[PDB]
Scaffold this motif. Sequence first.
Motif, mmCIF file in Angstrom:
data_model
loop_
_atom_site.group_PDB
_atom_site.id
_atom_site.type_symbol
_atom_site.label_atom_id
_atom_site.label_comp_id
_atom_site.label_asym_id
_atom_site.label_seq_id
_atom_site.Cartn_x
_atom_site.Cartn_y
_atom_site.Cartn_z
ATOM 1 N N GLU A 65 0.827 -1.211 0.000
ATOM 2 C CA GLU A 65 0.000 0.000 0.000
ATOM 3 C C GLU A 65 0.866 1.269 0.000
ATOM 4 O O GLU A 65 1.733 1.433 0.843
ATOM 5 N N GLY A 66 0.616 2.172 -0.956
ATOM 6 C CA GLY A 66 1.412 3.376 -1.117
ATOM 7 C C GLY A 66 2.520 3.342 -2.149
ATOM 8 O O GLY A 66 2.995 4.391 -2.597
ATOM 9 N N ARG A 67 2.970 2.150 -2.504
ATOM 10 C CA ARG A 67 4.112 1.975 -3.409
ATOM 11 C C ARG A 67 3.641 2.313 -4.836
ATOM 12 O O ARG A 67 2.494 2.024 -5.185
ATOM 13 N N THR A 68 4.504 2.879 -5.677
ATOM 14 C CA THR A 68 4.115 3.064 -7.076
ATOM 15 C C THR A 68 3.791 1.714 -7.717
ATOM 16 O O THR A 68 4.419 0.686 -7.400
ATOM 17 N N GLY A 69 2.815 1.727 -8.626
ATOM 18 C CA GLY A 69 2.444 0.548 -9.403
ATOM 19 C C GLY A 69 3.654 -0.132 -10.009
ATOM 20 O O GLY A 69 3.768 -1.355 -9.919
ATOM 21 N N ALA A 70 4.574 0.658 -10.601
ATOM 22 C CA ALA A 70 5.762 0.092 -11.265
ATOM 23 C C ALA A 70 6.658 -0.677 -10.289
ATOM 24 O O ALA A 70 7.160 -1.764 -10.603
ATOM 25 N N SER A 71 6.865 -0.103 -9.108
ATOM 26 C CA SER A 71 7.752 -0.706 -8.125
ATOM 27 C C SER A 71 7.122 -2.013 -7.620
ATOM 28 O O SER A 71 7.808 -3.042 -7.543
ATOM 29 N N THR A 72 5.823 -1.987 -7.355
ATOM 30 C CA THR A 72 5.066 -3.201 -6.987
ATOM 31 C C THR A 72 5.143 -4.302 -8.066
ATOM 32 O O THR A 72 5.390 -5.484 -7.764
ATOM 33 N N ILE A 73 4.900 -3.922 -9.319
ATOM 34 C CA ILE A 73 4.996 -4.869 -10.435
ATOM 35 C C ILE A 73 6.416 -5.415 -10.528
ATOM 36 O O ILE A 73 6.616 -6.628 -10.697
ATOM 37 N N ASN A 74 7.405 -4.532 -10.397
ATOM 38 C CA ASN A 74 8.807 -4.961 -10.529
ATOM 39 C C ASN A 74 9.286 -5.878 -9.407
ATOM 40 O O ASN A 74 10.082 -6.801 -9.658
ATOM 41 N N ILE A 75 8.781 -5.654 -8.190
ATOM 42 C CA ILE A 75 9.077 -6.559 -7.072
ATOM 43 C C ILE A 75 8.613 -7.961 -7.417
ATOM 44 O O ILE A 75 9.385 -8.917 -7.326
ATOM 45 N N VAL A 76 7.362 -8.086 -7.845
ATOM 46 C CA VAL A 76 6.798 -9.389 -8.137
ATOM 47 C C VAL A 76 7.469 -10.003 -9.377
ATOM 48 O O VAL A 76 7.715 -11.214 -9.421
ATOM 49 N N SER A 77 7.748 -9.180 -10.384
ATOM 50 C CA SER A 77 8.401 -9.674 -11.609
ATOM 51 C C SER A 77 9.805 -10.225 -11.339
ATOM 52 O O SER A 77 10.167 -11.322 -11.815
ATOM 53 N N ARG A 78 10.594 -9.465 -10.579
ATOM 54 C CA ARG A 78 11.964 -9.864 -10.275
ATOM 55 C C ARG A 78 11.983 -11.220 -9.605
ATOM 56 O O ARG A 78 12.783 -12.079 -9.957
ATOM 57 N N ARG A 79 11.085 -11.423 -8.655
ATOM 58 C CA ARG A 79 11.091 -12.664 -7.907
ATOM 59 C C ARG A 79 10.554 -13.867 -8.682
ATOM 60 O O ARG A 79 11.008 -14.986 -8.454
#
Length: 243
Positions: A65-79
Amino acid sequence: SNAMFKEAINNYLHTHGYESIDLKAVLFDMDGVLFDSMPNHAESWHKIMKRFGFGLSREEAYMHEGRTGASTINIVSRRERGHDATEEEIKAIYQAKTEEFNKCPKAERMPGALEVLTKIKSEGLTPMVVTGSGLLDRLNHNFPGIFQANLMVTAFDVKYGKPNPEPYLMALKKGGFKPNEALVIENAPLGVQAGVAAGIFTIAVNTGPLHDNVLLNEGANLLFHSMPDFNKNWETLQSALKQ
Ligand SMILES: [Mg+2]
């Protein structure tokens, strides 16, 4: 909580080297503080991420909650994939998520929010909205005459979002306030982290499914259990803050 408020206040003043908090402004997070929008945001993120082949649970959406959409997507993508998402993927995902949320746009006002904002406005204080959300018409309809366009910070006002202190720093800049002239009202761990990193006295209000400790561990100066709790305590808190 008179004496509890003083302890929090005095600890904050000591660690930052201020003589007092000279209250002029109250910086409100939007989602989960002003509007009860998080259930929709969490479900929309979860469902849209699933559609794009990614696993983001409703609970992990709350953690982000609060994180930019891109950063959230990138966290999940990286992992899941070992690399960041492309610009194309991120734009597609955000668009789908926006559309999905709008299947149910009208989040309720948080009980206690309009009442506390009216007290704050009456006292001559400046309320501001600070959101990682990408609405002043919606804000106007729900909190009439409370917020101002020049006194709002949204996803498009800033490069870096929570937990970066940028949104809150931009709020102080826009409003012409010092860190010891404001309060941050937050409901999410990354939001609390941003307020604390911005060096502003930060109040957590736990309006979601997470444990209080998730908020306290990010350095919240005070914690309330609900927006009605916060509202009920406003008079005592403002008094505690006045030197
Ligand atoms: Mg929030």
